Design a binder for this molecule. Structure first.
Ligand code: MG
Lengths: 221, 222
């Protein structure tokens, strides 16, 4: 699957959501450089104003795009499942607040890699950090601990995301993940190091998130 | 159990999830029903803010098991016979010269509370129409609900709702209904339900809401 990631690969992102009854849609376009672990994307809300903070959707809207080191090439499930693709599911627990359930498909559509997502948010508190938009427009660096999931012939990941709040302490989001192959069966413990930058397109009147991310793999000597 | 469950007053919880021309919203209602007297008292609230559609259009979509069937009609009602397991209630509502509603609901007992859970999708509603334009008066007329057996082992119903418009004209809503029992062994003749509704507001409620009082009795058989 490594052969399809050579050079620059186009990216398409689609998300459908419902948070405490609030529907919304997001569309993103950009490109990815798996060889260099670089992502550049621009997101727009096609339904108006986003009812939840943009940082909370960062993890939900890819991962093939990670640069796995030469001695770790065989451990990249994300790239190995292409072009057929894989299904990615999560339950995100915001401490003392609501929860997100997500289901996505990542696959090639022509020469474009597409990520179509469905998320449902429930039990979010009124005037909370999420529904109250009290989260800073930024993102911290994290470690995505990946482990094999023999039963589903895929992988599982666990990590806690730290969302900066406008005053000083931070809002935690526990992430639980499962990735499963879509077709024919081509596949150790390790982790991903992530860095993200959120920004704004000054000539865009629509709600915008501009994204730059750098991801590498490690954990094996 | 299935009629024995409705002696006296039963608590009610109602939940609706909807999408009209892309505008999702949710409504939650709580109240009580006294099937012996065919009476309902409920309060509904929009938990997502302002309703993108007029409240009266959601009345029929929001517990016919509380209808009052006469002693000589005990056999006839199917609503209570399907309890406590409950029944599925589906509808397609066509508003004349406007959009359409598709609904799916499950009505059943959860403990001592009768619960009605709903999904509603509205399509092809016109901009500046009576519906999306909020031109319907805050009231509800009396109707007759025509029920017939669907020996899907349930029932079907057809009727036309009359919504008063602010200008004085009326917006019609054709209702097509299908009910199927969730589990086993329920009762199935042609007859109708006579309905009366009263809409009001809670003076101390800032959220978009609707207070409803309803009286339903059955007839059509001598
Ligand atoms: Mg909904």
């Amino acid at each position: 699957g490594e052969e399809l990631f050579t050079g620059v690969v186009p990216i398409l992102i689609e998300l459908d959501g419902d948070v405490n009854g609030h529907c919304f849609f997001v569309r993103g376009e950009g490109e990815g450089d798996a060889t260099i672990g670089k992502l550049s994307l621009k997101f727009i809300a096609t339904t108006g104003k986003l009812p939840v903070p943009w940082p909370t959707l960062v993890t939900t809207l890819v991962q093939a795009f990670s640069r796995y080191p030469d001695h770790m090439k065989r451990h990249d499930f994300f790239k190995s499942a292409m072009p057929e693709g894989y299904v990615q599911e999560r339950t995100i627990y915001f401490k003392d607040d609501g929860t997100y359930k997500t289901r996505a498909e990542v696959k090639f559509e022509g020469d474009t890699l597409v990520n179509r997502i469905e998320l449902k948010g429930i039990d979010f508190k009124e005037d909370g950090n999420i529904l109250g938009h009290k989260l800073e427009y930024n993102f911290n660096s994290h470690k995505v601990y990946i482990t094999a999931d023999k039963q589903n012939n895929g992988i599982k990941a666990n990590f806690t995301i730290r969302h900066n709040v406008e005053d000083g302490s931070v809002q935690l989001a526990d992430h639980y993940q499962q990735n499963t192959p879509i077709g024919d069966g081509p596949v150790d413990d390790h982790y991903l190091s992530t860095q993200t930058i959120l920004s704004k397109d000054l000539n865009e009147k629509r709600d915008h998130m501009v994204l730059l991310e750098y991801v590498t793999a490690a954990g094996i000597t």
